[PDB]
Structures are given as C-alpha cells and as structure tokens.
Point group: C2
Chain length 247, copies 2
C-alpha cells in the first residue's frame, strides 16, 4: 500500500574506477534503511563496473539511453545494452538532456516507450525553468512534460516520476518543503485525473534539486514527496543520510 521511499543517485559525469570503487565500497558498507529503494546512475563507461561492485540490493541506472535496441547512432547506448550488463534502470529526460543537449519531449517519450518495453525501470524527469515559474506556467510545463512521458507508459509500476526544477539543480537553491509539496501534489493530481486513482496513489514522485543530508529530512516528510533524485551529494558520504531521510 504505502509508496516505498525511493532515492536515486545521479553521479552525472563524475569519477573514475578508483573513486567510484571507494564510493561504492562506502555504500556497500553503510547502515541503510531497509525501507528505501536505492538506485545509482553511473556514467555509461562505468555501468558494468558499477553493477559488479554494488550490492545487488542497490540498483543501477544508466544516465540516458536511445529509443531502439541498435543502429547507426554513434555515441548512444540502448536498453538492451543496459540489461546486458545487468542494470535495470535508466534515467530519462534529465534536466541536462533537455536543456544542455536539447532532448525534446517527443524524443524522451519514445525513449520511455522503448526502455519500458525492454524491461527497464525508468526514472522519468520533469521540471520548469525559472522564467517559466515566474511567468506562472509551472503547472502547464510539468503537465505537458508528464503527459509526453505518460503517453508512453502502459505499466507505471516501474516508473518513478522525478521533479527537478532547473533553477534548483546544482545551485544550492532547493525548493523549500512547502514548494516541493505543492508541485508534487499537483502532479499526483495530474496522474489521478489523466491516468487513474491507483497509479496516482502508487507512483513515486521524487524531488531533485540541491538535496543534501541537511535539507532532506524535511523534504521527505511531505505527504507527496516520495524520495529524491540526488546529484552532487550522491558522490558524497551524505548520500547515506539521504537514503536515511525519514529515519
């Protein structure tokens, strides 16, 4: 019944085998709350290494993939490859894919369709730019983004919605608990009106954007914040405190 608390650790473009080995070793040894679903997004070049070294009970997420299993797409990786090395997650639509690398909603949606059909779980990311927030269209944008994802999700049981407002990522400027709750509440409302009651109640909507061990307790306690997408802090020992946000 109650949604399992979920924290994903997006390492982004960071680390080598030495430092990621140390990061994993610390994680493998830490007292983690059994309640928490943990997944680590490793750089593609280290995904295989990450899955070998990480405890099986911690999942491994690719930081992106493409929308068919193979083809002339130099630089891309496909879900089949991600499954091939034993990872079971991909992060899709991350703020950086949309706004640094120009990945459209149509492309993200296709990626979501493909990854789910290949048996991966997806952390689908959404979020509005600061200018969109002050223009008043936060809802309009995240809903549009959520819909483009939702149009390609038959089974929500393996999707985690991740709300990361662009102006909070890497900035040390996180949503207050109140702000995150507000947007999460509205997304869950979206799911309830556009998909189903069950999917709204069962789907995890995690908060990303400058989450730390110091601010995570209070973000986690909000009714509709089901966990965290963590970037900068996911490279640090305080990722453990974040996994343990509730406890």
């Amino acid at each position: 019944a109650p949604r399992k608390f979920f924290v994903g650790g997006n390492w982004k473009m960071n680390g080598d085998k030495k430092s990621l080995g140390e990061l994993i070793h610390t994680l493998n040894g830490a007292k983690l709350s059994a309640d928490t679903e943990v997944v680590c997004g490793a750089p593609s070049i280290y995904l295989d290494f990450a899955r070998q070294k990480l405890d099986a009970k911690i999942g491994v997420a690719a930081q992106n993939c493409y929308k068919v299993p193979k083809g002339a797409f130099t630089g891309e990786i496909s879900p089949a490859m991600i499954k091939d090395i034993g990872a079971a997650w991909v992060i899709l639509g991350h703020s950086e894919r949309r706004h640094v690398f120009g990945e459209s909603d149509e492309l993200i949606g296709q990626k979501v369709a493909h990854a789910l059909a290949e048996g991966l779980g997806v952390i689908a990311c959404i979020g509005e730019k600061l200018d969109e927030r002050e223009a008043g269209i936060t809802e309009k944008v995240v809903f549009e983004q959520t819909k483009a994802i939702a149009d390609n999700v038959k089974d929500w049981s393996k999707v985690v919605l991740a709300y990361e407002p662009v102006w909070a990522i890497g900035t040390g400027n996180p949503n207050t608990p109140q702000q995150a709750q507000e947007v999460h509440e509205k997304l869950r409302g979206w799911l309830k009106s556009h998909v189903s009651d069950a999917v709204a109640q069962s789907t995890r909507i995690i908060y990303g954007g400058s989450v730390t061990g110091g601010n995570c307790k209070e973000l986690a306690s909000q009714h509709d914040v089901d966990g965290f997408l963590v970037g900068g802090a996911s490279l640090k020992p305080e990722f453990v405190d974040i996994i343990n946000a509730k406890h």
Copy 2:
C-alpha cells in the same frame, strides 16, 4: 615519411558482450597487415570490455565525449574516463552527432581541444549533407568544419581527419574513388595553406561512407585517401579485408 594507412571501425550502437566478444576474437586472430593502424570505436558501455579483450596492437576509441573532465552533464563521458579504462582515442564530430543529435562546430571544436589536451588521439569527422552537395557548397562546408577543428589543434600528430559525406553513411552509396580523391585533395590543400606543409603531408585523411571489402581497394589506392572510417562493415569479417585494403 609516408602516412601510415589507418582504419577505424566505428561499431556505433551495436553489440552486446557475447557478440562483441566474438567480433574481437575474430579480429584478434585475423592476419592483419602490420602496416595498418587499426582503432575500434566501441559503445561507451563496452569501452572497458573492448580494451581488455582487444589486442593492445589495436586501439580503442570512444564514440564521443564531452569537453571538461567532470561535471553536471548527465549522459556524458570525458577523456579522463576514456583514458581511465585504457582507451587512447575518441571519435568526434561524427555525422550522427551533428545531424541526429545537433552537435555544433563550436562544441565539436571544444571537444577536440579538450580531448587532445587530455592526451587522447582524435578522429575528427567532417562531411556535407546531400542538399549542400547539390547547392555546390561541399567545399565551403567541409572547410568550415575543418577550420572549427583546426582552431583547436596545436599538435596534428594525434589527429586523423575523417571525411564522411552524410549521403554515403550506411546507404550503400559510397563516394566513387574519384569523388573521395577530389574532396580529400581539397582538404589536404586547405591544411597546407591554413596550417602548414608538414601538417598537410603528415595528416591522415581517411574516407568514410559505405566502405566495404568490395570497394576499399580502389579507394585506398587514391593519392589522398589515407584509410577508412568504417561503420557497417566494421561489425563484419570483411573489416579485416578493409584493414588489408592495400595488400
């Protein structure tokens, strides 16, 4: 003095561990002309695997990278990571990066400056689209693209220029020997007037676009075609025949 014949196999988004493992075993065992510098561009998720399994006499290229060693760039890998798993090459400015994923000359130029500064060798790709070819601006375009690379190259000893017209990639419609010679000749001329004689005479300009065991011999025998960037056929046993184009 004479430029070493160079063949790069760009596997693009293809393979799993079983099948690349078979591709590598075949390649490792093949009678290859000692004359030929061979490099294999593996998918990023398989880079470490490819370097382990491939003979050290064959080089390994990443299919892309980004322009700083580390940071908030979800989905990206850096030269430091590529070096870290023991690969010495990156393919940059591939047709697919430019025309499927929208990578610009400015960005590709930054990637080249970084990769070279980090001590990777670079296979820098250039090429006009069909519509640009019939507009009669092939020269203008490849020159522009070559310049954007050249502005970020202090030491050409680790660069290979790759001319791959978009209409020739994967189409079974390659440049005739005559067509590639013509463009190659003009690129070499550019290098002479814009960089130096020595750089013009020493820099490999390889041709890409539908190179097969059947057509490679006659392309290789052209005065200014120094080798090949091979996609489709690089996944096949005839990659060996292409490595052996000259003999």
